[PDB]
Amino acid sequence: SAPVAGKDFEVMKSPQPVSAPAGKVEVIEFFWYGCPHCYEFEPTIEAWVKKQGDKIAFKRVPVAFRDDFVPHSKLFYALAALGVSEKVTPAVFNAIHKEKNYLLTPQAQADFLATQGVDKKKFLDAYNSFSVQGQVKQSAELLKNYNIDGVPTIVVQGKYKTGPAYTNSLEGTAQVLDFLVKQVQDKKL
């Protein structure tokens, strides 16, 4: 059955500006390294994004629901600043969820990433950079702008939100996302 508006996805009363160009559908994944659903969803969203390719503009935004997890948002943007996000991120998820290493401090992050081939000094310089600080503050602003209260949350074209909170299953989130993107492409949404 086709997804329904209000149950399987939410039409934001205040849509946000989309960064994707014309011809591409913007897809934003609000996630948290420590959220088990986000870890469980990673392979699904990765494959789906790669399959879509030039049809979408995918980005992730880290979420720090409490102050304790701001270091995870700094980690996200620090890995991006170093250009090693795609490579070491699976090890980051594994460290948090399977090795009981929650990577909650810059030092623990640096040590672990050192075991993954990342120079401690370069990573810490990125972690404490003003640019990463600004990106983290911006990610909090976006959490507010999109009215995100849970993760993982998928936002399509800055207007339609979905996720396991709406679909009760990660597969359901994927199916709704694919539907939403295709609806936007056909100009039906």
Author numbering: 9 to 197
Please give sentences taken from the publication describing this entry.
Oxidized BpsDsbA was co-crystallized with 2 in a crystallization solution that typically generated crystals of the apoprotein, that is 200 mM Li2SO4, 100 mM HEPES pH 7.5, 29.5% PEG 3350. A crystal was harvested and diffracted to a resolution of 2.3 Å with space group P21 and unit-cell parameters a = 69.4, b = 59.4 , c = 105.4 Å, α = γ = 90, β = 104.9°. As such they were modelled as alternative conformations of the same molecule (with occupancies of 0.43 and 0.31). Similarly, we modelled Arg74 of chain B (Arg74-B) with two conformations which differ depending on the presence or absence of fragment 2 in orientation B (binding near the Tyr110 side chain of chain B). The two orientations A and B of fragment 2 sit in an almost completely closed pocket at the interface of protein chains A and B.
Disulfide-bond-forming protein A (DsbA) catalyzes the formation of the disulfide bonds necessary for the activity and stability of multiple substrate proteins, including many virulence factors. DsbA works in tandem with its membrane-embedded partner protein DsbB, which is required to maintain DsbA in its active, oxidized state. B. pseudomallei is a Gram-negative bacterium that is found predominantly in tropical areas and is the causative agent of the deadly disease melioidosis. Binding was characterized using NMR and X-ray crystallo­graphy. Both 1 and 2 bind to a transient (or ‘cryptic’) pocket on BpsDsbA located adjacent to the redox active site which is not observed in the apo BpsDsbA structure.
